[PDB]
RNA sequence: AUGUGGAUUAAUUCGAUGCAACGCGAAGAACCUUACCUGGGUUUGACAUGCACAGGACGCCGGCAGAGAUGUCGGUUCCCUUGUGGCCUGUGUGCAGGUGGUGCAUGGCUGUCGUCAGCUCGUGUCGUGAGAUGUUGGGUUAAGUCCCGCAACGAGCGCAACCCUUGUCUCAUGUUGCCAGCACGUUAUGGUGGGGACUCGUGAGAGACUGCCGGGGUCAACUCGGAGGAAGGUGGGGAUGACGUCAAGUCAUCAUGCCCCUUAUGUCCAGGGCUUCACACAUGCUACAAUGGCCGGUACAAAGGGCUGCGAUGCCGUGAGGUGGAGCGAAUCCUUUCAAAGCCGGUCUCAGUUCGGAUCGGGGUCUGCAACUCGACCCCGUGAAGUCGGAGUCGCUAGUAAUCGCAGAUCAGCAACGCU
RNA sequence: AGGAGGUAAAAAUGUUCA
């Protein structure tokens, strides 16, 4: 939201702190910290700067992160689907693309409720 | 020589016990030694059926096929005994397996 | 139970303290058949109370029970019009059960980030005569004494 | 309908199986050709007194022991009928077929046959009450029995409304297991549909 | 059930017995292993051109008595209804009421 | 020698009792590595405590089937039966304590229409 | 889905229909009934009229839709609202 | 998630509508199934069988067109003994065929009141009679169970019992199952020789019957308590559903009277739909967390399933899974030497969180001709609502509820969180 | 066996043939 290598993403362990990034979960955090030489049991308050630099350059060289990844997602949706594919029609109308009961419970896409 | 491992399967414990008794009687008549009709476990193939043809899932009938099993290891093999067990007749409700 | 009263199940005596009562507390703390965990919880809370006050934790527990257990209870009765609350004498076993239940539930309500901690502290401030369990007891007695007029139904 | 089949109730204690063989993987097609057999000789010679169709088979042979009241109708003059049905069963074979017939001693005491008779007699002209009473009389006069129950259900007397009427004599303890309660069922054909005739015959308890 | 449906299931059975000598199995055992040179074969086209009824994926298991698709039991070749009837009547060896 | 058996909720145990210290050989393990729960241990040692023969006998065993509590109850029964065989005159005390009674309780079978052998479905009137 | 080792699935009818259109360099519409046949990087320009449940549904293929199964471009159901 | 209503739809097949419909028929909707829609074909038909037919082929194998049905081509295309039986060929004729209608015409099957304990009959008696009595009364019982009385005497269906399973113990029994006592194993364990000791399996049998003791009670049923016993009083649970009701449900398992279609209301194929979605109901799963999440280690199960099926070690993958196929028709082998919750330790430290896992993007695997509609699973990423739920409402009396996982049927695959 | 009085507040209706 402000930084890729947020100097304090949140004061807590690294394995779980790096997951405060739109392209990092628990296993990416673990494999990152393994490829580096950084413990995972250590909080972010106890960081250094060189740690942040190696993390930043590793990430920028290996995998994707907030802005570029989110743009990849939205561009995937729009462009690669199209105006009028099936998954695109259902993205457009705000409904579950992957095959789901729309009859009863598609609320995560449809919204809270519009009872008539 | 080699002992042999006559395996008896059926759906009726008294019929299969009768078959095993007949078999031990045969091999003892023709002069062999047997460990006995060891009573193997019984298979219990259960099936749940809806009683009604259209509805009423909560009304079932449970049908079991209770397959009984004995095994007969006869020692001291002899072609006498082999032909004896070849020519002994047993009911269709009992399956024999020679090994 | 129309035919009659059922048998009260015989509780086993705890080996760590020798107490039907701590066994009862275990059975009330229990959830999902997690008896071993409930034993761990109760043992931990008792040993925490021991570390706190430097005495016998079963005795502290019995003191909390003495401060929490009610002698009176209002039982509803739908008399014509609105419902009438009727004070009645609580049996000893009923008082004990209510006390343990209130301890466990008010502990589950309160907040110390660990059932052991919050149970121990509830036991302790009830032993002193402060906690929400004793508050429940006192409110119960207040309600009964208010409704003592309707005691003459005595059913 | 609430009552279970008495046979299915007392299937391993009093009654026994009308198919006496064993199989593991040939069970399915065994059952297939068995039901085909029963359908065949239920459609063919219904005029005969077919009661039981006890089948056995051991890997090359099928015994088709049927039980009948009119062997003269089972087999033709020089057994030409028996040879014909042997032929079509040897088509629908378990690789060889043999068809020793059995004569029942008591068509009045056999539940399926009593129901067969009631079914044929009632449709043409006799009243269901007459038929039921006649069957009950014959059965109880037959000495082995201890009781009988008859139940005719359907458009009785060509009525516009289905009726289920039952008669009985003696004892018919269906909830009791140690009871040779022979059961029989038949769907009498009628110009106004079909009439279900059930028969229960308690011919005494059973030994252990 | 419908006689057309019953005989159609048996037709697909015959088709499977005909076109499954290896004409539907050599294909799949060619496609599975990693040494498959089928990049030049493309006999998946041949498998398409085969009848879809030649595949046992279309093979429905009807009852043999009446043709009921659903409620079928493989051990018997029968629907639940006929299993009930015949097990009561004593026509299914070993099958009796279970009570326990 | 002296062998007994115990059963409790489909948990079988075979007990070879011998004279020794209060040591256990529950399938090559001890009374704490097997049954670390003090309640289970109490349940095991209850008969020996009632007869006042703690530490008189070593107990080898072949716990098989069932879970911890079933196995513990089975072993309780088995050692009680062993104490009967080695000293019948302690029979009244153990019989009063209820260590000879094999608890016949078992899992009640699930039943059709229900969910849990007594848990019926949620019954709505509408 | 559709394991890579087995390769893409394209009904042979549509294949013999489109390969000739390629090698003769004509791009008349193809009346192919089956949908289900994954678009492959062979016919971006040619138009198909796949869904025959109830409508013609032409579809001009592009670069952007290769690999996608042709029926995604041919909605079978119809919903406009209440 | 699943089912339903309604609304959509070309179709969203049909049935089920309080209790007793709504994870129901569906114990397995991608095509099939499928009955529905659009379109393409077909018509004695997809299957039959009797009659006149002229043949030796019928038919199978391939090719081409077609979405396919199928059509059109080319191969290979009868025995029998002269009359043939079979096979088709058509002319058709009969007719088949209808998951087309009426479950208020029906059988069968089922539910349900209710496993409630009641419902009846003969004879006799009372009454003009419908009817009553019996079957009421006192007591007892889980019970119209039993006793004492009684114009009733009796009987029958139901109750109970006989059956299964579980619970204790004996006799036999040792295999593939067990391992006390011997040895061999030295890895990896009853693993192997061995042994019946123990268990276990499975055959038979004993056992619980108020049988015994004490007290109450008609001195009777029966009851309270105790002994002994594994169990004490229908031991626990199943199976078992009287006469009958609800013109309950099913003409869509089947069968079926009557009615209707017979170039179609049949039938083949393809596609699509049964999976829609502004919504509402219902049954469940997963949760909202610390009695917890994650990580590591470590234990204890039962029951069941497996032949064109289980599928092992080993190897490759992160992992679904691929490879290969040992060994097993299975007390052996496989389903890890089967668990999970659990126990120990570590970490998180009350946050929309390392909760929650939906939804969504990408990349895959497996099934199958084929996963767009419309499968499951895996991986990476995303990380929604949800802070224990208004009125109201449901289940449960003990190995129960609550929780944990396991297996099976259907089934290629699964939408199974369901059912058993 | 011998011996005062009580309380349930209100709480409606039911197309068809039957």
Curated annotation (Swiss-Prot), chain A:
Top-level taxon: Bacteria
| One Pfam family this sequence matches | Ribosomal_S13
Question: Tell me, what does this protein do in biology?
Answer: Located at the top of the head of the 30S subunit, it contacts several helices of the 16S rRNA. In the 70S ribosome it contacts the 23S rRNA (bridge B1a) and protein L5 of the 50S subunit (bridge B1b), connecting the 2 subunits; these bridges are implicated in subunit movement. Contacts the tRNAs in the A and P-sites.
Q: Which PANTHER family match?
A: 30S RIBOSOMAL PROTEIN S13/40S RIBOSOMAL PROTEIN S18, SMALL RIBOSOMAL SUBUNIT PROTEIN US13M
Q: Where is this region: Disordered?
A: 94-116
The subunit structure is:
Part of the 30S ribosomal subunit. Forms a loose heterodimer with protein S19. Forms two bridges to the 50S subunit in the 70S ribosome.
The record's annotation in InterPro entries points to: Rbsml_uS13_C (IPR027437), Ribosomal_uS13 (IPR001892), Ribosomal_uS13-like_H2TH (IPR010979), Ribosomal_uS13_bac-type (IPR019980), Ribosomal_uS13_CS (IPR018269)
Which residues are in coiled coils?
none
SUPFAM superfamilies assigned = S13-like H2TH domain (SSF46946)
Q: Print the keywords alphabetically.
A: Ribonucleoprotein, Ribosomal protein, RNA-binding, rRNA-binding, tRNA-binding
Family designation? Belongs to the universal ribosomal protein uS13 family.
Its organism's taxonomic lineage begins at: Bacteria, Bacillati, Actinomycetota, Actinomycetes, Mycobacteriales
**Name this protein carries in UniProt:** Small ribosomal subunit protein uS13
From Swiss-Prot, chain D:
One molecular function GO term is: mRNA binding
Any one GO CC term of the record: cytosolic small ribosomal subunit
KH type-2 domain sequence ranges: 37-105
| One Gene Ontology biological process | translation
The organism's place on the tree of life at top rank:
Bacteria
Q: What does this protein do?
A: Binds the lower part of the 30S subunit head. Binds mRNA in the 70S ribosome, positioning it for translation.
Family from the record: Belongs to the universal ribosomal protein uS3 family.
Note in the entry: Binds 2-aminothiazole antibiotics, which are antitubercular agents.
Residue spans crossing the bilayer: none
Tell me the protein's name: Small ribosomal subunit protein uS3
Report quaternary structure and partners: Part of the 30S ribosomal subunit. Forms a tight complex with proteins S10 and S14.
Q: Does the keyword rRNA-binding apply?
A: yes
- The range of the complete sequence contained here reads 2 to 209 of 275
Where does this protein come from, organism-wise?
Answer: Mycolicibacterium smegmatis (strain ATCC 700084 / mc(2)155)
Indicate whether Ribonucleoprotein appears among the record's keywords. Answer: yes
From Swiss-Prot, chain E:
Tell me the keywords, alphabetical order.
Ribonucleoprotein, Ribosomal protein, RNA-binding, rRNA-binding
GO MF entry, a single one? rRNA binding
Top-rank lineage group of the source organism? Bacteria
Cellular component (GO) terms are: small ribosomal subunit
Instruction: Output the Pfam families linked to this UniProt entry.
Output: Ribosomal_S14 (PF00253)
Please tell me whether the keyword RNA-binding is annotated for this protein.
Answer: yes
- Note the InterPro entries from the entry: Ribosomal_uS14, Ribosomal_uS14_bac/plastid
Question: Its GO biological process terms?
Answer: translation
Task: Give me the disulphide-bonded residues.
Answer: none
Q: How is the quaternary structure described?
A: Part of the 30S ribosomal subunit. Contacts proteins S3 and S10.
Tell me which family the UniProt entry assigns to this protein: Belongs to the universal ribosomal protein uS14 family.
Q: What role does it play? A: Binds 16S rRNA, required for the assembly of 30S particles and may also be responsible for determining the conformation of the 16S rRNA at the A site.
Q: What is this protein called?
A: Small ribosomal subunit protein uS14A
Which gene is this protein's source?
Answer: rpsN
UniProtKB/Swiss-Prot annotation, chain F:
Keyword Ribosomal protein, does the record have it?
yes
Q: Which GO terms describe its molecular function?
A: RNA binding; structural constituent of ribosome
GO cellular component terms, semicolon-separated: cytoplasm; small ribosomal subunit
Any GO BP: translation
Locate the coiled-coil region(s) and give their ranges. none
Q: Which cysteines are joined by disulfide bonds?
A: none
Alphabetically sorted, this entry's keywords are: Ribonucleoprotein, Ribosomal protein
Family recorded in the similarity comment: Belongs to the universal ribosomal protein uS9 family.
**Protein name per UniProt:** Small ribosomal subunit protein uS9
Q: What is the lineage of its organism?
A: Bacteria, Bacillati, Actinomycetota, Actinomycetes, Mycobacteriales
